[PDB]
Symmetry: D3
Subunit: 141 residues, 6 copies
């Protein structure tokens, strides 16, 4: 089943939005199969204006997540809201919580291919957990 | 404002503990609860879709308010959860169209039919909200 | 575990839009909803339950909840009967001020729960079903 | 287009009566906007006449208290209105204040300045300069990107 | 009819707890009769400084039956270490020196605090449309 | 700089309480320095019927930092036995059965050190400073 990479960026962790973000994905019906707190290294930030974006991204921890579900790549992005918080609607994470595109609190993979790459980049295979939600028959026909 | 609509928490909604959450959103909006009942549809009432619909309880509700048929549907969000926006019930809580948590009458006429189908007249309560002048100008 | 209790949102609770909030808390706790009904008590029903007039003046929501220790646990969720003594986090602690407008009711014992359930609900109105989360809430 | 931009937000009397003051303030705080003015007041008949059916809207608006607020942040005039939702609740989407809480355009719970110029005028009309408080949020670097 | 003074201290305002605190008082059934974002005046500071020998903050006045004690119950114990979850400080504070809010500790001190922070003309007397639902 | 170990047990993960639990610790002012989703091995559960349930699915392991966080974290979780947990706590709000009590927190500073070391390798913990430290602590 489809998987996507969702991150709480360092502004999101600093502003105490980790639980709130996780809650919204859980409530939606998506399944958490990877989760990790980490501080990106400068080198990881270099791979991911330049000195500035690198420095912010390696300045503090992010929370990396892998979520599983039908249409979760697109759906996860819908939950996050438009990338640019000026365009984000209330009810979304960015619409509720962000102002500035450079401090937009979170990230979600923008396609299936890019999800596979991002998951592989941040998570070793052994760190992902395959399990079955006891609610699968209530969420999916 | 005396328009009425039928809202249901389907069995997946009840199983996933969304009854209170749904009621809350209608109450917050300003709509008035005039009928409420927990029931398990019979196979016959349902008559794959039949089996799921008669497999467990639903919560049936009648809500009253100005434009409540359309408004109730806006609160539920698009019927197909792929199209539902966050902030709506389905946008927040549903993934699959076949397990889309809830239902709202799609028109005034079909609301009248649905209400009559699930509720006996005596089961609906007419009352006046002490907030009516705060919610409606006239 | 199959224990059951009667919970009511009194008319002030319904008027003040607390029905959903109360149901949510019971659902969140893990208790199972097996009866639910909106109704306006008759004066006669209020007599059995000034207090008469208020109680029969508008609708209440009657509920039956099932779970281990649900009679006591339901009352703990409601908070002390007198809101002056109710702690924040409970329904009355969060939402009520006056004992005469204390928003809700819960059966005070197993025996009185059986009586209250039987009084407000006909047998055919209660639904027996199994939560898909039963093994996540209960070890045995 | 400055982060120092300011807008006027009001909880109208219906919003105060229906206990939506805290909820409205929370949404602005959550968004990252900064509260620089706040005041509970009952508009006078004369103040209601200027603000705006010219029998009826006046009477309701001067009938009880409103909460007046000044919020500061990048694009806060437009952003504040997005949080409130469409002016007519029929058009307001869930997730917004009016989409979540209002039904009738005549009882639409709140108000926000519709432009930068009208925000300056509204702020000046409801607040004396000495009532606004300038301070710095300890989260400014988390909300706004430094070059 | 009783009234009390509740304040969101500067840490509370900085940490975005103003709405959350107001909400809890509204939800409880108490009535907001004074509200203002404020900075002490030089004259207010002088008199505070003198009185201790016996910003911004948000200042509030709330009205209701038993609101002085009730308001404090909503805030939770003064020292957050002792505050229980469900209260403001139990949910949101760790350190007694950054305990987010304040409520008058008695009826007499409420009168004094209200008078100190609010001019009489800044309080609004009004009737909640829900008064008969909250009070018998 | 005190630290404690908090876990969402498998029932808690299954019942979608991870975010809710994290939120409460964040709201309180505590600082997240370790976070990981994992499925305990049978061997790991033996050291911690109870073995089978604990190794049956994923838990979320967390390390939190703050003044008095060991005791404070337990106060947020509520009494170990949900029958005794008060509303406003995680177990008071969400749990019924002591065998399915949703979560765990270290019971002392010494046991927190042991539990943190057991579940987290040193390189998995992140040391950082909250931009709100001076708003949460007077001495910071």
């Amino acid at each position: 089943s489809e998987r996507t990479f969702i991150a709480v960026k360092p502004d999101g962790v600093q502003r105490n939005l980790v639980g709130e973000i996780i809650k919204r994905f859980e409530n939606k019906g998506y399944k958490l199969v990877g989760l990790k707190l980490l501080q990106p290294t400068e080198e990881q930030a270099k791979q991911h204006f330049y000195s500035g974006l690198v420095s912010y991204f390696s300045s503090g921890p992010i929370v990396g997540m892998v979520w599983e579900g039908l249409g979760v790549v697109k759906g996860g992005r819908v939950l996050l809201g438009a990338t640019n918080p000026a365009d984000s609607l209330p009810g979304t994470i960015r619409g509720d919580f962000a102002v500035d595109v450079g401090r937009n609190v979170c990230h979600g993979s923008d396609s299936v291919e890019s999800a596979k790459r991002e998951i592989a980049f941040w998570f070793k295979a052994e760190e992902l957990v395959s399990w079955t939600s006891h609610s699968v028959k209530q969420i999916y026909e």
